[PDB]
C-alpha cells in the first residue's frame, strides 16, 4: 500500500499515507487484542514488522500519527470511565509501548507522552489490583513508565504507591502495616512456596487473558525486580530517599523473615542499606537567594540639546509690538 | 523547615569554621517522630521538609513548577486554594487536551529492534508477547 501510494506517484499521496499511518497504528493495536496464543510465532513475525513500517511512516507522518495517538488516549479514558479495568486490554499495553518506540519519552513536555503518562499513573492508583490478572497488568504498566523515564528519571509517586500494596498483598495483614490500603486479602501466597526453583519472571501478554502459585510468584518477582531497578535509578538521587524507601524496607523485611530462603529482598535490603549509608541526609537549604543589586535607571536627555504655535504667535507679537512703539516715537 | 541557615557554606567562612560545619553535618539526625499523636511533641520544627524538595522532580511539569515555588522567594501573600482543591485525573487530562499552546511532536532517534523481550535491542525487557 505504501509503495503503491508514494508521494511522488500522484498528488495527495502524502495525505493518503498520512491517514494510513493512523490506520496502521489501530491495526497494530487491533491484532494484539485478537487472540494469538495459537500462532504466537506468526503473530510475532507480523506484530514487530508492522511496527517497523509504522516507524518509517511516523518519520514522515508523525503529525498524523500524533493526532491518532491522542484520540486513542481520549477514547480509552472514556472507556475507563465506564468499564474501568474491563476497558483495559492487551492492545492498550501494546499501544503505550509503541509511543515509547515512536516518540521521545525524555521530554518535560510532549504531545502524546504527557497525556499518556498522566493516564498510566491513573491506572497505577485508581485500579483496584485485586486479581492476579490486574496485578500482572500493573507490572507491565510499571515497566512501561520506568522505560519512559529511563533517562529523565523523574519521580512518580504512583509507582511508590503501587509497589507498597502489591508487596503487602502477597504477604496478607501482618498487623504492622495499617497505613497501606489493600483491595484484596485472599491473594496471600502460601508458606510452602519454594522460592529456590528458577521461575521465569517474564510475563507474557497472552497469559493474562488466561488468568496458580507459580503464576503468583512470577508476577511477584517481575514487580519486585522493577522495584530494585527503581531504587537504583530514580530514588537514589531524590533527597527524600530515606523517607520514600522506609515503608518499602519494612515490607521487604517481612518477606525475608517469613521466607528465609527467598533471596532478592535481602539483596534489595542489603542494597538499600548501602545507599542510606553513603547518602548524607543534611537539612535542605533552598531559601538562599542571590543578593539583588541596587536599581538601575537610564538617563533622560536630548541627543542634540538646544541651549505650541499660539505661544510662537505670542512671541512674534512682542517683537513686532516692540518695534512699532519705537517706530511711533 | 524550608531552610536552616546554620548549615550554609559561606566562602568567607574560615577553615576552622569549615571544619565545624563538617562536624555539624555529620552529627545531624532527623528528630521528627511519625508515631507521636500529640502534634506539639513531634519535634517537627527541628526537622526539614525534604519531601517537598523531591516533589520539584515530580513527573508532572506543572506540579514540579508548583513545588519549585519553595525554591523561589515568597513574594506572593497567599494562594487561592479554591483554584487548586477540586482537581481530578480527568480534569488534568482534559486540561492537557485543552492547552493554550500547541507544540510540534518530536521523535526518538534511538532505535529498538523489538518492543518486547523474547521468551538486538529490546525497549521493554522483562515483558514478552
Amino acid at each position: 500500500i505504501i509503495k503503491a501510494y508514494q508521494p511522488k506517484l500522484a498528488e495527495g499521496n502524502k495525505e493518503k499515507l498520512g491517514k494510513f499511518t493512523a490506520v496502521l497504528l489501530r491495526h497494530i493495536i487491533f491484532l494484539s487484542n485478537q487472540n494469538y496464543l495459537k500462532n504466537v510465532q506468526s503473530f510475532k513475525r507480523t506484530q514487530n514488522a508492522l511496527i517497523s513500517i509504522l516507524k518509517s511512516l511516523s518519520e514522515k507522518y508523525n503529525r498524523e500519527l500524533s493526532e491518532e495517538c491522542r484520540d486513542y488516549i481520549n477514547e480509552m479514558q472514556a472507556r475507563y470511565k465506564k468499564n474501568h479495568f474491563d476497558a483495559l486490554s492487551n492492545g492498550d499495553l501494546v499501544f503505550f509501548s509503541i509511543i515509547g518506540i515512536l516518540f521521545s519519552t525524555s521530554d518535560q513536555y510532549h504531545l502524546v507522552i504527557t497525556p499518556a503518562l498522566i493516564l498510566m499513573s491513573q491506572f497505577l492508583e485508581q485500579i483496584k489490583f485485586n486479581s492476579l490478572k490486574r496485578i500482572a497488568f500493573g507490572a507491565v504498566l510499571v515497566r512501561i513508565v520506568s522505560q519512559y523515564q529511563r533517562i529523565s528519571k523523574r519521580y512518580i509517586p504512583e509507582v511508590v504507591y503501587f509497589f507498597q500494596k502489591i508487596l503487602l498483598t502477597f504477604i496478607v495483614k501482618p498487623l504492622d502495616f495499617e497505613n497501606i490500603r489493600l483491595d484484596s486479602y485472599e491473594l496471600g501466597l502460601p508458606l510452602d512456596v519454594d522460592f529456590t526453583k528458577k521461575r521465569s519472571t517474564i510475563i507474557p501478554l497472552h497469559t493474562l487473558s488466561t488468568m496458580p502459585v507459580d503464576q503468583c510468584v512470577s508476577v511477584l518477582l517481575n514487580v519486585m525486580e522493577s522495584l530494585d531497578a527503581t531504587i537504583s535509578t530514580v530514588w537514589k538521587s531524590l533527597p527524600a530517599f530515606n523517607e520514600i524507601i522506609l515503608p518499602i524496607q519494612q515490607l521487604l523485611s517481612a518477606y525475608t523473615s517469613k521466607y528465609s530462603d527467598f533471596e532478592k529482598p535481602r539483596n534489595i535490603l542489603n542494597k538499600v542499606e548501602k545507599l542510606t549509608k553513603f547518602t548524607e541526609h543534611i537539612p535542605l537549604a533552598l531559601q538562599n537567594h542571590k543578593p539583588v543589586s541596587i536599581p538601575t535607571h537610564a538617563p533622560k536627555y536630548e541627543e542634540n540639546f538646544n541651549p505650541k504655535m499660539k505661544a510662537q504667535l505670542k512671541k512674534e507679537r512682542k517683537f513686532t509690538m516692540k518695534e512699532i512703539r519705537k517706530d511711533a516715537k | 523547615m524550608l531552610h536552616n541557615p546554620a548549615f550554609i557554606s559561606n566562602p568567607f567562612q574560615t577553615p576552622d569554621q569549615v571544619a565545624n560545619l563538617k562536624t555539624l553535618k555529620e552529627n545531624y539526625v532527623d528528630p521528627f517522630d511519625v508515631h507521636e499523636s500529640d502534634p506539639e511533641l513531634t519535634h517537627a520544627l527541628d526537622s526539614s521538609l525534604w519531601e517537598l524538595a523531591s516533589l520539584m522532580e515530580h513527573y508532572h511539569p506543572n506540579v514540579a513548577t508548583l513545588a519549585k515555588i519553595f525554591a523561589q522567594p515568597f513574594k506572593k501573600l497567599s494562594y487561592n486554594m479554591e483554584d487548586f482543591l477540586d482537581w481530578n485525573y480527568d480534569s488534568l487530562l482534559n486540561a492537557e487536551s485543552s492547552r493554550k499552546l500547541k507544540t510540534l511532536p518530536t521523535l526518538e532517534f534511538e532505535a529498538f529492534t523489538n518492543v518486547f523481550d523474547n521468551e538486538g535491542n529490546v525497549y521493554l525487557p522483562g515483558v514478552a508477547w
Partner: peptide, 30 residues
Amino acid sequence: ELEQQRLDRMNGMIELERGVEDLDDGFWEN
C-alpha cells in the same frame, strides 16, 4: 545535534523555543 536537542527538551525547552514556565500561565486558574 540530536543529543543536544534532547538535553534541552529535557530541561524544559519546548518547540512550538519556549519554556515550561510559559505553559504554566493560567492553567491552574481555569
